[PDB]
Nucleic acid binder design. Structure first.
Length: 272
RNA sequence: UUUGCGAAUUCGCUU
RNA sequence: UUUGCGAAUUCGCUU
Protein backbone atom coordinates (compact mmCIF):
# COMPACT_ATOMS: atom_id res chain seq x y z
CA UNK A 1 0.00 0.00 0.00
CA UNK A 2 1.03 3.65 -0.54
CA UNK A 3 0.31 6.66 1.74
CA UNK A 4 -2.62 8.91 0.81
CA UNK A 5 -3.29 12.62 0.44
CA UNK A 6 -6.72 14.12 1.19
CA UNK A 7 -7.70 17.60 0.00
CA UNK A 8 -10.87 19.57 0.66
CA UNK A 9 -12.36 21.43 -2.29
CA UNK A 10 -13.40 24.41 -0.18
CA UNK A 11 -16.21 26.49 -1.69
CA UNK A 12 -17.44 29.95 -0.65
CA UNK A 13 -19.86 32.32 -2.40
CA UNK A 14 -17.78 35.50 -2.15
CA UNK A 15 -19.96 37.55 -4.54
CA UNK A 16 -23.62 36.54 -4.81
CA UNK A 17 -25.48 37.13 -8.06
CA UNK A 18 -26.61 40.79 -8.14
CA UNK A 19 -30.33 41.46 -8.78
CA UNK A 20 -29.57 42.79 -12.26
CA UNK A 21 -27.88 39.54 -13.25
CA UNK A 22 -30.48 37.18 -11.79
CA UNK A 23 -32.44 36.77 -15.01
CA UNK A 24 -34.18 33.53 -14.07
CA UNK A 25 -34.99 35.00 -10.66
CA UNK A 26 -33.47 32.15 -8.62
CA UNK A 27 -32.85 31.77 -4.91
CA UNK A 28 -29.14 31.94 -4.13
CA UNK A 29 -27.49 28.79 -2.66
CA UNK A 30 -24.16 29.50 -0.90
CA UNK A 31 -22.11 26.23 -0.81
CA UNK A 32 -20.82 27.07 2.67
CA UNK A 33 -24.34 26.65 4.05
CA UNK A 34 -24.15 22.85 3.91
CA UNK A 35 -21.39 20.81 5.51
CA UNK A 36 -21.24 18.02 2.96
CA UNK A 37 -18.81 18.93 0.17
CA UNK A 38 -16.24 17.38 -2.16
CA UNK A 39 -12.58 16.51 -1.92
CA UNK A 40 -9.69 14.89 -3.74
CA UNK A 41 -7.80 11.74 -2.82
CA UNK A 42 -4.37 11.52 -4.44
CA UNK A 43 -1.25 9.30 -4.40
CA UNK A 44 1.05 12.32 -4.74
CA UNK A 45 0.70 15.85 -3.25
CA UNK A 46 -1.04 18.63 -5.17
CA UNK A 47 1.06 21.75 -5.83
CA UNK A 48 -0.24 24.77 -3.90
CA UNK A 49 -2.46 26.61 -6.41
CA UNK A 50 -3.92 30.03 -5.49
CA UNK A 51 -7.65 30.61 -4.91
CA UNK A 52 -9.69 30.91 -8.12
CA UNK A 53 -13.35 31.75 -8.98
CA UNK A 54 -15.94 29.49 -10.56
CA UNK A 55 -19.03 31.26 -11.81
CA UNK A 56 -22.17 29.40 -10.69
CA UNK A 57 -25.88 30.09 -10.69
CA UNK A 58 -25.72 31.74 -7.25
CA UNK A 59 -22.83 34.04 -8.12
CA UNK A 60 -19.07 33.95 -7.76
CA UNK A 61 -17.71 31.02 -5.73
CA UNK A 62 -14.10 31.17 -4.47
CA UNK A 63 -12.41 27.79 -4.89
CA UNK A 64 -9.63 26.90 -2.45
CA UNK A 65 -7.87 23.57 -2.09
CA UNK A 66 -6.48 22.88 1.39
CA UNK A 67 -4.74 19.80 2.75
CA UNK A 68 -6.94 17.76 5.12
CA UNK A 69 -4.75 14.72 5.86
CA UNK A 70 -1.65 12.90 4.61
CA UNK A 71 0.44 9.81 5.20
CA UNK A 72 -2.45 7.47 5.90
CA UNK A 73 -3.54 4.22 4.32
CA UNK A 74 -6.83 3.00 2.98
CA UNK A 75 -8.01 -0.59 2.56
CA UNK A 76 -8.62 -2.02 -0.89
CA UNK A 77 -12.38 -2.16 -0.18
CA UNK A 78 -12.45 1.53 0.77
CA UNK A 79 -10.63 2.72 -2.36
CA UNK A 80 -12.80 0.50 -4.60
CA UNK A 81 -15.77 2.27 -3.01
CA UNK A 82 -14.24 5.72 -3.41
CA UNK A 83 -13.39 4.93 -7.05
CA UNK A 84 -16.83 3.67 -8.04
CA UNK A 85 -18.23 6.87 -6.55
CA UNK A 86 -15.69 8.88 -8.42
CA UNK A 87 -17.00 7.26 -11.64
CA UNK A 88 -20.67 7.69 -10.64
CA UNK A 89 -20.27 11.45 -10.19
CA UNK A 90 -18.92 12.02 -13.67
CA UNK A 91 -20.95 9.44 -15.58
CA UNK A 92 -24.38 9.54 -13.91
CA UNK A 93 -24.66 12.86 -12.14
CA UNK A 94 -22.80 15.01 -14.65
CA UNK A 95 -23.19 12.53 -17.53
CA UNK A 96 -19.76 12.96 -19.16
CA UNK A 97 -17.21 11.01 -21.25
CA UNK A 98 -6.52 14.06 -9.79
CA UNK A 99 -6.88 10.43 -8.76
CA UNK A 100 -10.20 10.40 -6.84
CA UNK A 101 -12.99 12.86 -6.16
CA UNK A 102 -15.09 11.90 -3.18
CA UNK A 103 -17.69 13.31 -0.71
CA UNK A 104 -16.64 14.75 2.65
CA UNK A 105 -18.84 15.50 5.60
CA UNK A 106 -18.38 16.35 9.27
CA UNK A 107 -18.97 14.18 12.33
CA UNK A 108 -14.64 17.90 11.64
CA UNK A 109 -14.40 17.20 7.89
CA UNK A 110 -13.75 13.57 6.85
CA UNK A 111 -14.53 10.99 4.11
CA UNK A 112 -18.28 10.42 4.10
CA UNK A 113 -18.27 6.62 3.71
CA UNK A 114 -21.81 6.15 4.94
CA UNK A 115 -23.06 8.59 2.31
CA UNK A 116 -21.42 6.52 -0.38
CA UNK A 117 -22.92 3.28 0.90
CA UNK A 118 -26.37 4.90 0.94
CA UNK A 119 -25.94 5.78 -2.74
CA UNK A 120 -25.10 2.16 -3.63
CA UNK A 121 -28.17 1.01 -1.67
CA UNK A 122 -30.55 3.50 -3.29
CA UNK A 123 -32.89 2.49 -6.13
CA UNK A 124 -33.05 6.02 -7.64
CA UNK A 125 -29.26 6.02 -8.18
CA UNK A 126 -29.44 5.36 -11.94
CA UNK A 127 -33.01 5.80 -13.22
CA UNK A 128 -36.66 5.47 -12.19
CA UNK A 129 -37.61 3.26 -9.17
CA UNK A 130 -40.71 1.07 -8.97
CA UNK A 131 -42.93 2.54 -6.24
CA UNK A 132 -46.50 1.22 -5.71
CA UNK A 133 -49.24 3.33 -4.11
CA UNK A 134 -52.85 2.23 -3.45
CA UNK A 135 -55.86 3.59 -1.55
CA UNK A 136 -54.62 1.62 1.46
CA UNK A 137 -50.92 2.37 0.86
CA UNK A 138 -51.20 5.95 -0.43
CA UNK A 139 -48.27 8.20 -1.18
CA UNK A 140 -47.21 10.08 1.95
CA UNK A 141 -45.77 13.59 1.68
CA UNK A 142 -42.91 14.60 3.99
CA UNK A 143 -42.05 18.29 3.49
CA UNK A 144 -38.48 17.80 4.69
CA UNK A 145 -37.77 15.13 2.06
CA UNK A 146 -38.21 17.88 -0.55
CA UNK A 147 -36.32 20.67 1.28
CA UNK A 148 -33.03 19.84 -0.51
CA UNK A 149 -34.01 17.42 -3.29
CA UNK A 150 -33.36 16.52 -6.88
CA UNK A 151 -36.40 14.79 -8.27
CA UNK A 152 -37.04 12.84 -11.42
CA UNK A 153 -40.32 12.21 -13.25
CA UNK A 154 -41.22 8.53 -13.01
CA UNK A 155 -43.72 8.75 -15.84
CA UNK A 156 -41.57 9.82 -18.81
CA UNK A 157 -38.10 9.82 -20.35
CA UNK A 158 -37.24 6.29 -19.20
CA UNK A 159 -34.39 6.06 -21.73
CA UNK A 160 -32.62 8.95 -19.99
CA UNK A 161 -34.53 10.57 -17.13
CA UNK A 162 -34.74 14.31 -16.45
CA UNK A 163 -33.55 15.49 -13.05
CA UNK A 164 -34.80 18.71 -11.50
CA UNK A 165 -33.90 20.74 -8.48
CA UNK A 166 -36.92 21.28 -6.29
CA UNK A 167 -37.09 25.10 -6.37
CA UNK A 168 -40.31 25.69 -4.39
CA UNK A 169 -42.95 23.74 -2.45
CA UNK A 170 -46.33 25.23 -3.33
CA UNK A 171 -48.33 24.41 -0.18
CA UNK A 172 -51.32 26.28 -1.62
CA UNK A 173 -51.64 23.95 -4.59
CA UNK A 174 -52.82 20.34 -4.84
CA UNK A 175 -53.32 17.91 -7.73
CA UNK A 176 -56.87 19.34 -7.82
CA UNK A 177 -55.73 22.95 -8.27
CA UNK A 178 -56.61 24.51 -11.62
CA UNK A 179 -54.40 23.56 -14.54
CA UNK A 180 -52.33 26.32 -16.25
CA UNK A 181 -53.38 24.93 -19.66
CA UNK A 182 -57.12 25.34 -20.46
CA UNK A 183 -57.60 21.89 -22.07
CA UNK A 184 -57.54 20.46 -18.55
CA UNK A 185 -59.26 21.56 -15.35
CA UNK A 186 -56.88 20.03 -12.81
CA UNK A 187 -53.42 18.51 -12.51
CA UNK A 188 -55.07 15.24 -11.47
CA UNK A 189 -57.02 15.19 -14.74
CA UNK A 190 -53.99 16.15 -16.85
CA UNK A 191 -51.89 13.23 -15.65
CA UNK A 192 -54.89 10.93 -15.80
CA UNK A 193 -56.04 12.09 -19.24
CA UNK A 194 -52.53 12.27 -20.77
CA UNK A 195 -50.49 9.67 -18.85
CA UNK A 196 -53.22 7.47 -17.35
CA UNK A 197 -51.91 8.20 -13.84
CA UNK A 198 -54.02 7.92 -10.70
CA UNK A 199 -53.08 9.76 -7.52
CA UNK A 200 -53.55 8.20 -4.07
CA UNK A 201 -52.86 11.49 -2.31
CA UNK A 202 -54.84 14.63 -3.20
CA UNK A 203 -53.58 16.90 -0.43
CA UNK A 204 -49.97 16.91 -1.48
CA UNK A 205 -48.54 20.30 -2.36
CA UNK A 206 -47.03 20.65 -5.84
CA UNK A 207 -43.41 21.28 -6.81
CA UNK A 208 -41.82 24.19 -8.69
CA UNK A 209 -38.66 23.03 -10.47
CA UNK A 210 -35.35 24.04 -12.04
CA UNK A 211 -33.25 21.97 -14.54
CA UNK A 212 -29.96 20.54 -13.22
CA UNK A 213 -27.71 20.64 -16.31
CA UNK A 214 -25.03 23.30 -17.04
CA UNK A 215 -21.98 24.04 -19.17
CA UNK A 216 -18.74 22.20 -18.42
CA UNK A 217 -16.55 25.29 -18.11
CA UNK A 218 -17.54 27.81 -15.43
CA UNK A 219 -14.20 29.63 -15.11
CA UNK A 220 -15.61 32.66 -16.92
CA UNK A 221 -18.90 34.46 -16.11
CA UNK A 222 -22.10 33.98 -18.18
CA UNK A 223 -22.23 37.67 -19.25
CA UNK A 224 -30.96 31.37 -33.83
CA UNK A 225 -34.03 29.57 -35.25
CA UNK A 226 -33.01 26.46 -33.35
CA UNK A 227 -31.50 28.63 -30.63
CA UNK A 228 -34.81 30.50 -30.33
CA UNK A 229 -36.98 27.37 -30.15
CA UNK A 230 -34.69 26.09 -27.36
CA UNK A 231 -35.09 29.30 -25.29
CA UNK A 232 -38.89 28.86 -25.26
CA UNK A 233 -38.62 25.12 -24.55
CA UNK A 234 -36.27 25.74 -21.65
CA UNK A 235 -38.61 28.37 -20.31
CA UNK A 236 -41.67 26.08 -20.44
CA UNK A 237 -39.46 23.42 -18.81
CA UNK A 238 -38.64 25.67 -15.85
CA UNK A 239 -42.26 26.76 -15.31
CA UNK A 240 -43.32 23.11 -14.95
CA UNK A 241 -45.13 22.26 -11.73
CA UNK A 242 -44.67 18.66 -10.60
CA UNK A 243 -46.63 16.23 -8.44
CA UNK A 244 -44.38 14.70 -5.74
CA UNK A 245 -46.24 11.37 -5.92
CA UNK A 246 -45.16 11.21 -9.57
CA UNK A 247 -41.46 11.78 -8.85
CA UNK A 248 -38.66 9.72 -7.43
CA UNK A 249 -36.25 11.56 -5.16
CA UNK A 250 -32.62 11.20 -6.29
CA UNK A 251 -30.21 9.99 -3.55
CA UNK A 252 -27.79 12.84 -4.27
CA UNK A 253 -29.07 15.89 -2.39
CA UNK A 254 -29.60 19.11 -4.26
CA UNK A 255 -26.99 21.15 -2.33
CA UNK A 256 -24.31 18.62 -3.20
CA UNK A 257 -25.52 18.39 -6.81
CA UNK A 258 -24.90 22.13 -7.12
CA UNK A 259 -21.27 21.63 -6.01
CA UNK A 260 -20.74 18.63 -8.32
CA UNK A 261 -21.31 20.73 -11.44
CA UNK A 262 -18.32 22.86 -10.42
CA UNK A 263 -15.99 19.82 -10.45
CA UNK A 264 -14.98 19.68 -14.10
CA UNK A 265 -14.05 23.40 -13.93
CA UNK A 266 -11.89 22.81 -10.87
CA UNK A 267 -10.21 19.62 -12.17
CA UNK A 268 -9.48 21.47 -15.43
CA UNK A 269 -7.93 24.43 -13.56
CA UNK A 270 -5.79 22.03 -11.47
CA UNK A 271 -4.46 20.35 -14.64
CA UNK A 272 -4.20 23.20 -17.23
C1' U B 1 -28.57 24.79 -20.88
C1' U B 2 -23.48 23.10 -23.69
C1' U B 3 -24.91 21.21 -30.32
C1' G B 4 -32.23 19.46 -25.25
C1' C B 5 -34.89 15.30 -28.04
C1' G B 6 -37.12 14.30 -32.97
C1' A B 7 -39.09 15.41 -37.77
C1' A B 8 -39.32 18.63 -42.56
C1' U B 9 -37.81 22.02 -46.46
C1' U B 10 -33.92 25.48 -48.81
C1' C B 11 -28.67 26.36 -49.64
C1' G B 12 -22.89 26.27 -49.70
C1' C B 13 -18.41 22.99 -49.87
C1' U B 14 -15.21 18.34 -53.70
C1' U B 15 -13.36 17.71 -59.72
C1' U C 1 -21.13 6.21 -46.89
C1' U C 2 -22.88 5.18 -41.18
C1' U C 3 -26.12 10.88 -38.61
C1' G C 4 -20.05 13.64 -44.76
C1' C C 5 -18.79 18.94 -43.20
C1' G C 6 -21.28 23.77 -42.35
C1' A C 7 -25.15 27.41 -42.61
C1' A C 8 -30.72 28.91 -42.85
C1' U C 9 -36.07 28.63 -42.27
C1' U C 10 -40.76 25.82 -40.61
C1' C C 11 -42.84 22.37 -37.04
C1' G C 12 -43.81 18.55 -32.81
C1' C C 13 -42.48 17.11 -27.60
C1' U C 14 -42.65 19.30 -21.15
C1' U C 15 -46.87 21.85 -17.18
Amino acid sequence: DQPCYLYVIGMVLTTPLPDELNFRRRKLYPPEDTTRCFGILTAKPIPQIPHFPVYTRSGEVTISIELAASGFMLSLQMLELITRLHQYIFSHILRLEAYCVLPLNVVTLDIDFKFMEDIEKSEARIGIPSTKYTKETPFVFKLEDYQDAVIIPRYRNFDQPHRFYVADVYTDLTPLSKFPSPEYETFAEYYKTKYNLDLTNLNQPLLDVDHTSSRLNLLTPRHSSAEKRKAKWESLQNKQILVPELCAIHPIPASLWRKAVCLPSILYRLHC
